[PDB]
Symmetry: C3
């Protein structure tokens, strides 16, 4: 899978990015059985103030995780995985759970290429 992780610049130190990448990657491997190396975490940083919730400009605490997955997993498992990402990223980023949004999009496997293969 590819996890696009949208954060404000300087919210995560390099240490914190590695911890957040680990939490997401371990959750994905642990819950789906997909091998570690097939999980990409791609941090997308923007300046503080580029996030609006109900039209209101936020600080730097919002984390939006957009996971791009293969189709074919149950709703139950997807929910568990989304919940695990919230819990584990919140510990990893020392950030309140309320700041974390997680959406999964799904695609047929045949239109998903990792490692040019």
């Amino acid at each position: 899978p590819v996890y696009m992780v949208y954060v404000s610049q300087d919210r995560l130190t390099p240490s914190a990015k590695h911890a957040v990448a680990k939490a997401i990657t371990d959750a994905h491997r642990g819950l789906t059985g997909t091998q570690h190396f097939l999980a990409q975490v791609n941090f997308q940083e923007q300046p503080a103030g580029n996030v609006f919730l109900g039209g209101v400009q936020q600080g730097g605490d919002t984390i939006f995780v957009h996971g791009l997955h293969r189709e074919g997993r149950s709703a139950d498992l997807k929910g568990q995985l989304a919940q695990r990402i919230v819990d584990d990223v919140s510990v990893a980023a020392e950030i309140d759970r309320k700041h974390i949004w997680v959406y999964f999009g799904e695609m047929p496997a045949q239109q998903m290429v990792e490692y040019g293969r």
Copy 2:
């Protein structure tokens, strides 16, 4: 929903970002009935020249809105909403309609987490 809004750096002033966030958020609330606070607008700025249309390098005027929505709305309503975003963002950003692209992607509700809930 989460609206990822891809713009060139310095095309939108902070004022203009707030106006564009308001236009998108109000359209979403007005047309779907989803509460204001459940709409995130996340501005993703890049340097001028990172956008190509038919292989041709553009200036800073392109706005691409990628709205990430729950599945289950009619094609008619989605079209209305996309059209409203074009009209209202174009007023809000003082930008010609021809510069505005809007795509909606949809997901089962059970794999969509807002506010860590």
Copy 3:
């Protein structure tokens, strides 16, 4: 379509971006018949070190292409197109194929607006 192309800052020169935009755009036109001008390539650059594969922090060589397409093409054609993007971007960016990830997401045509139309 819209091709979001996630690369590290300074990995692609402006020349290389134009070459990568051309390779993607030509592949899309050649394989689907969709007119050139309907293909957007939108480069999203981040600082080196924002990409993790299996939890491991990468250099600046990863290219992730997220193509946002209309629904309705065959799995065979989508696979061919994904493969062509890998081959052609790898020549265009002078980058090993193993660095290139390509995922296609699909949407009903009626929720896809290009050029405000």
